[PDB]
From a paper:
Respiratory complex I is a ~1 MDa membrane protein complex with key functions in aerobic energy metabolism. The electrochemical gradient established by redox-coupled proton translocation drives ATP synthesis.
A cryo-EM map of complex I purified from Y. lipolytica was obtained from 124,626 particle images and refined to 4.3 Å overall resolution. The final model of 42 subunits was 88% complete and contained 7515 fitted residues. The cryo-EM structure of complex I agrees well (r.m.s.d. of 1.768 Å for central subunits) with the previously determined X-ray structure in the deactive state, which was however much less complete with only 4979 residues fitted. We identified density for all expected 28 accessory subunits of Y. lipolytica complex I. In the membrane arm we detected density for a new accessory subunit with a single transmembrane helix (provisionally labelled X in Figure 8). Four lipid molecules were identified in the membrane arm. In our map only residues 35 – 48 in the central part of the long TMH1-2 loop of subunit ND3 were disordered. In contrast to bovine complex I, we observed continuous density for the loop connecting the first two β-strands of the 49 kDa subunit and for the TMH5-6 loop of ND1. The C-terminal domain of accessory subunit NUEM, which is supposed to have a regulatory function in the A/D transition, was largely modelled with side chains, whereas the corresponding domain in the mammalian 39 kDa subunit was disordered. However, this can now be excluded, as in our cryo-EM structure of Y. lipolytica complex I no inhibitor was present.
Residue numbers in the entry:
A (entry chain g): 4 to 63
B (entry chain 6): 2 to 184
C (entry chain X): 4 to 120
D (entry chain 3): 1 to 34, 49 to 124
E (entry chain W): 63 to 121
F (entry chain L): 1 to 86
G (entry chain D): 2 to 81
H (entry chain 9): 9 to 67
Write the structure that this text describes.
């Protein structure tokens, strides 16, 4: 049986996800976290501001 | 005033009574059995003092992890114990420990506030006598929070959190590279 | 924007790597710092061979060999990264004076034009 | 008082009760007839158990007040989890037992 | 919480009269206890002149 | 602050007069780090919200790694796992 | 078909916790009077519910029925 | 690194003393500083209470 | 109470143990009566000796018999 | 031991207040808001400006801001008595889950804005507000069994 | 004062009588699952076997010269006191609105489920047998390694909660049926839940006669019924704890009881009924959960310690750290964070 | 840019074939390029030594601390070259030890300080027993661990009392509090003696020394120098107690006598361990100062380069012995290296100039370390401590010259037939040439630190 081998990355991700896949599908979640966290600044398109508060002491 | 519920705070007598066991045990591990009793008495103290949160933290992480790890080691490669505090092993004990207990009592006295005398040494021992603190009422506390403010400070002082990330990193890499012995 | 009235203070120039937040300050900011650069943008390229100069540092690691094998890629990454920090160490400043000061020519105008933030 | 202190006080006495029932009426009459070894994976598992507990203790106030730290506590804890997950990618490479005796080399003749 | 903050002056003023009326009355009680020998009951412990709260009371 | 100084001092001079059992010394040195927190927590309670209790959660998280390195180093007080020796 | 015997222990394991929940509900409405029960709104009912105890029992809507401000409570406790 | 304290109210009137450089006047902050100290430990409060209970003891 | 639960410990030496585990078979089930045997001579009540008994076994059998409650 | 101190006196230099009543004022919380808001603001402003110098806004604002709330609760005890009463009666159950009585809310608010012509201005422009008719949310569990007939009849008669 | 002690007696007799008949229940359902019939003979119907077995196995009580009685006479009482019973101090949704618990729920349950582990370890410490205590260290090691990934997942499901008192999770979860419908890692919680309270398909330290004809120590007598009752009670507690947070209490027919109680009762007749159906909801969410424990008892065989540590420290835990690289991420992305 | 280097090469040591002699070449060249392209912060460093603070708790003092971390980088580059050119997988924790040391040289406030001293100490506990197939290291590591634990809780108890008297933590808030409540002084000397575990002040004396002789020589170079500079650089960066108010002066009196009275030693490691102890005791004397850091900043480098140098010289002297000691530790006796001048006597010349360094003959080091030390002393007025420092220098010079007098007597039978062992020779030649040519540029630094 064959492990993963780096030098062909399109091949590596294949024969990682097919022979020792159980860390692949973890790290797919690990890349779905922050990369999708960077594809939101257009995707919220200024959706909402939460607007919470402690006590509003006002001005003169 | 529910007479015992006022001296339920003074549980320090059980603390010193457990710690006098903790250094004179029979077996090497009946001591660390008593150590978790020391920690749960500390948790009882912290719940009584107004912070049950850190009581439950100590129950979760000290007798949940590190005392479990003391018991975990003391099964395997058990060290050769001297039997107990024999009188020949209580030799040169009193002759320095009495003076050391006196000097450390004076150190606890040196934790006192500002007096350049021995008056502050007696002042902290009478600290409960002239005083019982007065609580107050809620002036504009909007949201309920006990350890939430701890994380607020952990956001303000974020850099020590990102550095104790490194100390937990060391806590896992060290025991790899000191016991695994790669081939 | 993007957060509350809380503030994040960071005037960072050290050996522990940091960055900047969205905005509220007078010092160097996050996204403007990668821009307003110069022809020193190949300074990160100058390090890009320097950690790839470890092959030149190989004066007989083993006996009678050279050209350390293809982990130089890793070195190349570090040859980028430190130099990137060195490019990010080219905070000339954010709108101070008494320096090279192209910021009053290439970033005074942006603070002029963007008159709504 | 009066709420659950009754439970944590009643229960030890119930434990001593169902213990101390049969200490008396069970027949005893006790007649007669009534260093070590190791592995790295028997020890390093519990050693490395502890830091991954108390990083959860680190994470627990953050998950208590996830709010009041918006857009920024997320960033800090993502950096914290990055610094921890690289420790995980260190320890994935090594921790397993090794079967000592299984040989396969080809056989030669003169 | 907005609901609660609209209640927040009111309730605090509910206490404030109390922390006027509890404070000076305690001081008057101690005027009765410390009379005879001249003494600084009628004196702030805090050297800044601004009103504080009494604390650490013996019951 | 009697409650923390007394357990600290007794752990300390237990660590002095410990002519038996290396691990009782080791756990007395552990219990120093919870004799100090009973000082720290009640000083924070007598003061305020989170100023010293932040240092308390720090010293708990770090006392874990203390005991971890102490065990994983005490394992190597000898040869490793087990062989012939003397 | 279904096991007529085997679901009888599940029937009593259902009924025991069922009666155990109903008894908690009854004993808390008898504890509190004919109302539901409050959760921990920490630091806040000890302003609010304590104030209700300083005035009345249960709840009331009026102007004020205090006397010596209905005897303003002040908590005190020993030094640690 | 100073949460919403029960002694925060004496930072400002200590720090506004050290707003100007009167820590090199070296005494202008000492009323402010020891009022900060009495917020910390209530020492002269406690001596005042010990005095009045000693007067209580002689009746 | 003693007559109801009634669990043994298997000693189970030969063919007669095959019939003993046929009593754990679904046709003539043990658990319709309560017989739920543990593999431990202290947690046991009765000690079914099944199979033939060698000369070699018998001290082990009596040692099992002694570590068994009254 | 959290023992209670319960001393008594009365201090001279001002006219005494009138206190307020129980947790049912949580129903009336917005109702004192828009009316007594500048009184509130001037009170807390005068408190914050006198740095440490409390106990001097008592005679001006500590009396004034309570006078306004006493006036508001007297107006609501004459205007919508039982409409207030069933609403806080709902609201003392359900843990003061203020979502948990949002149908008798509309009855009480319509009655107030009818007779005492106030509102509930929750400040913030982005979302929708008090009429939500929830539709992905945590509406109620026990839907105020003495009060569902009330909002049903208000849908019926009005 | 009198009402709460009769409250606590009702709740204790519920849990004790419950865990008594639970063993008969599981043996019956194994038996029908094993194509036979369970205890069908005891006394009056056949619901009574454990209730006679408890009186049976009291009256044995041996001690062993290889071990101090002072530890093993108390260590199964330890896990009987703490692991079994005072886990119910949190009143793990005592299924109404109300509880017998003040507040600060989930990490108390964490602390006591953590506290049981050296109750197992010191139990196995006994008798000084060089083949025994290594098996004890095995048991406790796998026990803590799955404690960790109970812990690190029910702290991440409360990231949709952020409030640490017990009820607020439950009132939060009634809108979505939040528990499993938004996330199916319930199942790995379930496969974590068989390990940290080992009534498992793992059976791992129950190498019953692979050792010298004894597995744990064979501390038979009152410590046996203590260990037995505490294991089953830890099972129904952690099963309730599953039905507490990551499976839901407060079934949606009580949400629809707005369309039912308003058609049934007039106005608050002593709250007579709703706590009962709420208890019915939580009970049927709890026993249907442990029916899968009684499945997995008799479906898949033991699980091979080295592969068990493989199953902890290699697969489930990095999937887990991915899964709370996204549940902070995805709610931050989609709209926003939760308040408290 | 150290954290990025750590997280990079912990991933690089993962999935490595345990060659593990190349990764240090990458770390050496990476620290070299990082210093070469990160020295550009010296222009933005100081107009008038303007400090810069990270988030209120961390301090960047651009004249002092920006030189200290440059020295740390320098000696780390030297150690990393010393492992190149017998090893296990360890440079990850070398770098994180550096991270801790640099945090304590940048730590404004005690939370960062305590985290980082404990991180640093954990690194020392680990590095002591990486070479786990020893009986020396096994004992020494556990001894270092237990006493570092005692001294750690001494740290934390000092600062907890400091918090008990003042609700702040920062020494920035100490701000010349001249009413000087006496417990503030006692807390501060307790914190001083707590941080002074590493110097092994004469009541805390012996325990470090058995640890130094029970580590391999490739390790005892590293931890006779890292915390030696680290905790003291913190201790001079903030001047805790302006004078001693006789507490610390007594500690250094019994040190600089009672560690130089440790004269007769036959073990090499003990000998230069006492050397590195007493020369660390030297720079404690200007912990007793105020507004004085130039002598300290110069004395660190103009000691530590030569300390590194003498360890590298007795590294080179393994090749010439005709006996060795244990697998981990080659050369422990002085009398092992007898006739070294009849071997390659250029290194005997280097050993000569770096020991004449430590005795302080004028034209290379001692008239620029000890001269600045003595002018900092006699600026304050500590007249007695001057003459006891002089006695310390003479009696230290005696066992210093013990090494040169055993170095160049006469060889029994060894001259010459060999192969070569080089390309790290430029490191030792760089340290020796910078030792004996600092008298050239001994005035440029005097202007540069006058402008910083
Ligand atoms: C999404 C697309 C991204 C495109 C980006 C485009 C931008 C262009 C920039 C160009 C630079 C390229 C950067 C890529 C670096 C990838 C590293 C690599 O692949 O080296 C392979 C190499 C594998 O070793 P090998 O011996 O050559 O392969 C042997 C076998 O074939 C077996 O080899 P293997 O395949 O099994 O290797 C295992 C590897 C899996 O193999 C992979 O590389 C898959 C990773 C795919 C990319 C995901 C990571 C990139 C995301 C950004 C960096 C996150 C970290 O697992 C990991 O190493 C995980 C890395 C850490 C992730 C957590 O790794 C190394 O030897 C060491 C290199 C590590 C240097 C990188 C350090 C940078 C990390 C930055 C962290 C920032 C921390 C900030 C903290 C701030 C505190 C205040
Ligand atoms: C975040 C935490 C979640 C997972 C991280 C946990 C560790 C994963 C890293 C890892 O396991 O790498 C090692 C593995 C090969 O290691 P191995 O050879 O088995 O070593 C054993 C030798 N005894 O290497 C592997 O094969 C497992 C890692 C595979 C994952 C590779 C990256 C997948 C991510 C997909 C995004 C790729 C980015 C480019 C996408 C193209 C553009 C759309
Ligand atoms: C994507 C959108 C959503 C995003 C959120 C994602 C949430 C998803 C929910 C969680 C994901 C589920 C992950 C399940 C983890 C299980 C992984 C696993 O078991 O790996 C198999 C592994 C095999 O062993 P090994 O030989 O080492 O594998 C290498 C082979 N080359 O290990 C093993 O040895 C197998 C042992 C498993 C033991 C299980 C025993 C029976 C359990 C069945 C009872 C559960 C059924 C009841 C609940 C179901 C309710 C519907």
């Amino acid at each position: 049986a064959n492990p993963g081998f780096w030098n062909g990355p399109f091949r590596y991700l294949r024969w990682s996800a097919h022979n020792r896949p159980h860390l692949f599908f973890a790290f797919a979640i690990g890349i779905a976290g922050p990369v999708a966290a960077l594809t939101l600044t257009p995707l919220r398109r200024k959706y909402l501001y939460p607007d919470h508060s402690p006590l509003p002491q006002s001005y003169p | 005033m529910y007479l015992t519920y006022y001296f339920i705070e003074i549980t320090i007598f059980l603390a010193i009574l457990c710690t006098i066991f903790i250094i004179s045990a029979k077996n090497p591990m009946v001591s660390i059995l008593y150590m978790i009793a020391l920690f749960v008495i500390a948790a009882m103290y912290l719940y009584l003092i107004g912070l049950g949160i850190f009581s439950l933290l100590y129950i979760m992480i000290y007798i949940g992890a590190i005392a479990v790890l003391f018991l975990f080691i003391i099964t395997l490669l058990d060290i050769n114990s001297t039997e107990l505090s024999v009188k020949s092993n209580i030799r040169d004990l009193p002759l320095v420990l009495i003076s050391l207990i006196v000097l450390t009592i004076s150190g606890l006295m040196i934790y006192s506030n500002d007096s350049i005398l021995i008056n502050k040494l007696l002042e902290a021992f009478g600290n409960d006598y002239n005083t019982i603190i007065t609580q107050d009422w809620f002036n504009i506390e909007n949201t309920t929070l006990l350890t939430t403010i701890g994380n607020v400070l952990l956001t303000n002082n974020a850099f020590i959190l990102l550095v104790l990330a490194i100390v937990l990193l060391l806590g896992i890499i060290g025991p790899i590279s000191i016991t695994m012995k790669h081939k | 924007s993007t957060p509350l009235v809380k503030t994040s203070v960071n005037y960072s120039y050290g050996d522990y790597p940091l960055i900047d937040a969205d905005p509220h300050f007078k010092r160097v900011v996050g996204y403007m710092r990668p821009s307003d650069y110069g022809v020193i943008g190949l300074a990160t390229a100058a390090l890009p061979a320097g950690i790839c100069f470890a092959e030149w540092l190989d004066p007989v690691k083993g006996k009678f060999a050279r050209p350390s094998v293809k982990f130089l890629r890793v070195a190349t990454m570090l040859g980028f990264a430190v130099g990137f920090g060195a490019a990010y160490a080219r905070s000339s400043l954010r709108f101070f004076g008494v320096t090279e000061n192209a910021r009053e020519y290439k970033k005074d105008e942006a603070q002029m034009a963007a008159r709504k933030a | 008082m009066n709420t659950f202190i009754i439970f944590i006080i009643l229960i030890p006495i119930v434990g001593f009760a169902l213990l101390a029932v049969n200490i008396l009426l069970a027949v005893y009459k006790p007649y007669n007839e009534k260093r070590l070894a190791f592995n790295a994976a028997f020890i390093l598992v519990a050693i490395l158990f502890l830091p991954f507990d108390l990083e959860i203790s680190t994470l627990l106030p953050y998950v208590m007040s996830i709010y009041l730290v918006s857009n920024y506590g997320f960033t800090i804890v993502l950096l914290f989890l990055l610094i921890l997950i690289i420790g995980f990618v260190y320890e994935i490479n090594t921790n397993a037992l090794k079967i000592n005796k299984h040989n396969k080399p080809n056989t030669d003749s003169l | 919480l907005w609901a609660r903050i609209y209640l927040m002056p009111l309730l605090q003023a509910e206490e404030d009269r109390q922390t006027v009326r509890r404070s000076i009355a305690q001081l008057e009680r101690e005027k009765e206890i410390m009379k005879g020998t001249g003494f600084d009951v009628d004196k702030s412990v805090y050297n800044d002149g601004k009103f504080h709260a009494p604390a650490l009371m013996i019951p | 602050m009697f409650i923390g100084t007394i357990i600290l001092v007794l752990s300390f001079l237990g660590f002095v007069f410990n002519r038996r059992n290396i691990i009782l010394a080791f756990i007395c040195l552990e219990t120093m780090l919870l004799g100090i927190n009973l000082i720290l927590l009640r000083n924070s309670v007598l003061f305020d919200d989170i100023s010293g209790s932040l240092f308390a959660i720090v010293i708990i998280i770090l006392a874990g790694v203390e005991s971890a390195i102490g065990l994983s180093l005490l394992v190597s007080y000898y040869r490793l796992r087990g062989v012939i020796n003397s | 078909a279904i096991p007529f015997e085997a679901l009888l222990p599940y029937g009593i394991i259902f009924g025991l916790l069922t009666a155990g929940g109903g008894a908690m509900q009854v004993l808390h409405v008898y504890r509190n009077g004919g109302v539901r029960d409050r959760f921990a709104i920490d630091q806040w009912d000890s302003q609010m519910m304590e104030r209700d105890l300083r005035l009345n029992g249960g709840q009331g809507r009026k102007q004020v029925d205090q006397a010596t401000a209905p005897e303003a409570f002040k908590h005190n406790h020993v030094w640690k | 690194t100073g949460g919403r304290n029960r002694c925060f109210s004496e930072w400002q009137s200590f720090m506004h003393c050290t707003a100007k450089t009167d820590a090199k006047s070296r005494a202008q902050c000492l009323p402010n500083f020891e009022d900060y100290m009495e917020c910390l430990h209530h020492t002269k409060e406690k001596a005042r209470l010990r005095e009045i209970e000693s007067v209580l003891k002689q009746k | 109470a003693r007559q109801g639960s009634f669990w043994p410990v298997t000693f189970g030496l030969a063919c007669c143990a095959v019939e003993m585990m046929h009593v754990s078979a679904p046709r003539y089930d043990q658990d319709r009566l309560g017989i739920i045997f543990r593999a431990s001579p202290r947690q046991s009540d009765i000690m079914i000796v099944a199979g033939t008994l060698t000369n070699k076994m018998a001290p082990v059998l009596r040692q099992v018999y002694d570590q068994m409650p009254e | 031991p959290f023992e209670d101190k319960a001393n008594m006196p009365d201090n001279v230099p001002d006219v005494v207040e009138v206190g307020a009543t129980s947790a049912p004022l949580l129903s009336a919380s917005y109702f004192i808001g828009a009316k007594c808001k500048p009184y509130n603001d001037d009170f807390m402003l005068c408190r914050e400006e006198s740095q440490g110098s409390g106990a001097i806004d008592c005679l001006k604002e500590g009396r004034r801001v309570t006078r306004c709330a006493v006036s508001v609760i007297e107006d609501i005890n004459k205007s919508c008595l039982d409409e207030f009463r069933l609403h806080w009666q709902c609201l003392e159950q359900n843990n003061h889950q203020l979502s948990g009585c949002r149908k008798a809310e509309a009855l009480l608010n319509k009655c107030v804005f009818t007779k005492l012509n106030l509102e509930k201005k929750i400040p913030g422009l982005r979302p929708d507000e008090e009429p939500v008719f929830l539709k992905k949310d945590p509406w109620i569990k026990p839907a105020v069994d003495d009060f569902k007939s009330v909002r049903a009849y208000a849908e019926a008669k009005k | 004062m009198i009402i709460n002690i009769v409250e606590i007696l009702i709740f204790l007799v519920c849990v004790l009588f419950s865990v008594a008949y639970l063993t008969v229940a599981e043996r019956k359902t194994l038996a029908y699952m094993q194509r036979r019939l369970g205890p069908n003979f005891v006394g009056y119907y056949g619901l009574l076997q454990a209730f006679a077995d408890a009186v049976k196995l009291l009256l044995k009580e041996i001690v062993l010269p290889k071990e101090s009685n002072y530890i093993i006479l108390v260590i199964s009482p330890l896990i009987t006191l703490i692991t079994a019973l005072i886990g119910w101090v949190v009143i793990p949704l005592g299924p109404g609105i109300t509880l017998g618990e003040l507040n600060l729920g989930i990490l108390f349950s964490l602390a006591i489920g953590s506290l049981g582990v050296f109750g197992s370890l010191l139990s196995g410490w006994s008798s000084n047998s060089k083949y025994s205590l290594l098996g004890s260290i095995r048991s406790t090691a796998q026990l803590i390694s799955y404690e960790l990934i109970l812990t690190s997942i029910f702290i991440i499901i409360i990231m949709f909660v952020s409030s640490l008192n017990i009820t607020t999770i439950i009132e939060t979860q009634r809108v979505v049926w939040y528990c499993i419908p938004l996330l199916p890692l319930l199942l790995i919680f379930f496969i974590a839940s068989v390990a940290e309270t080992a009534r498992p398909p793992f059976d791992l330290t129950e190498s019953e006669s692979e050792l010298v004809a004894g597995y744990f120590t064979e501390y038979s007598g009152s410590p046996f019924v203590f260990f037995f009752l505490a294991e089953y009670s830890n099972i129904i507690l952690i099963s309730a704890f599953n039905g507490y947070l990551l499976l839901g209490g407060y079934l949606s027919f009580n949400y629809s009881y707005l369309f039912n109680i308003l058609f049934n009762d007039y106005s608050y007749v002593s709250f007579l009924f709703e706590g009962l159906i709420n208890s019915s909801a939580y009970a049927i969410k709890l026993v249907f959960l442990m029916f899968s424990f009684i499945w997995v008892r008799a479906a898949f065989p033991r699980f091979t310690y080295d592969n068990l540590i493989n199953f902890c420290w290699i697969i489930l835990l990095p999937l887990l750290f991915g899964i709370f690289l996204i549940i902070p991420s995805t709610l931050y992305i989609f709209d926003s964070f939760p308040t408290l | 840019m150290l954290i990025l280097a750590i997280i990079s090469l912990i991933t690089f040591v993962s999935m490595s074939k345990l060659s593990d002699n190349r990764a240090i070449i990458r770390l050496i060249n990476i620290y070299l390029i990082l210093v070469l392209v990160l020295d550009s912060f010296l222009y933005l460093l100081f107009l008038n030594n303007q400090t810069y603070t990270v988030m209120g708790e961390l301090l960047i003092f651009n004249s002092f601390t920006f030189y200290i971390d440059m020295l740390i980088y320098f000696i780390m580059i030297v150690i990393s070259s010393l492992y190149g050119y017998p090893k296990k997988e360890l440079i990850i924790l070398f770098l994180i030890n550096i991270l801790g040391a640099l945090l304590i040289v940048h730590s404004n406030d005690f939370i960062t300080l305590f985290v980082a001293i404990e991180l640093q100490s954990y690194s020392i506990y680990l590095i002591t027993a990486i070479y786990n197939s020893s009986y020396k290291a096994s004992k020494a590591s556990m001894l270092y661990f237990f006493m570092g634990g005692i001294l750690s809780i001494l740290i934390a108890y000092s600062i907890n009392t400091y918090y008990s008297v003042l609700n702040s933590y920062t020494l920035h808030s100490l701000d010349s509090l001249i009413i000087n409540t006496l417990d503030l002084n006692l807390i501060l000397i307790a914190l001083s003696l707590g941080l002074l575990f590493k110097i092994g002040i004469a009541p805390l004396h012996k325990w470090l020394i058995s640890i130094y002789e029970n580590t391999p020589i490739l390790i005892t170079i590293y931890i006779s120098l890292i915390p030696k500079i680290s905790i003291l650089s913190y201790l001079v960066l903030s001047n805790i107690s302006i004078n001693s108010l006789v507490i610390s002066i007594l500690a250094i009196l019994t040190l600089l006598v009672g560690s130089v009275g440790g004269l007769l030693q036959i073990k090499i490691k003990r000998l230069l361990a006492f050397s590195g102890l007493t020369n660390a005791g030297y720079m404690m004397l200007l912990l007793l100062l105020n507004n004085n850091e130039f002598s300290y900043l110069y004395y660190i480098t103009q000691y530590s380069i030569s300390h590194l140098a003498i360890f590298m010289i007795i590294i080179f002297s393994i090749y010439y012995i005709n006996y060795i000691n244990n697998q981990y530790n080659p050369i422990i006796y002085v009398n092992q290296l007898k006739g070294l001048i009849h071997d390659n006597a250029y290194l005997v010349l280097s050993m000569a100039i770096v020991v004449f360094s430590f005795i302080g003959i004028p034209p290379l080091l001692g008239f620029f370390g000890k001269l600045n030390i003595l002018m900092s002393i006699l600026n304050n007025g500590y007249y007695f401590i001057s003459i006891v420092l002089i006695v310390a220098s003479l009696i230290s010079a005696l066992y210093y010259l013990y090494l040169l007098n055993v170095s160049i007597q006469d060889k029994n039978n060894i001259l010459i037939n060999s192969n070569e062992t080089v390309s790290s020779v430029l490191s030792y030649i760089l340290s020796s040439l910078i030792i004996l040519i600092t008298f050239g540029f001994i005035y440029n630094s005097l202007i540069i630190d006058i402008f910083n």
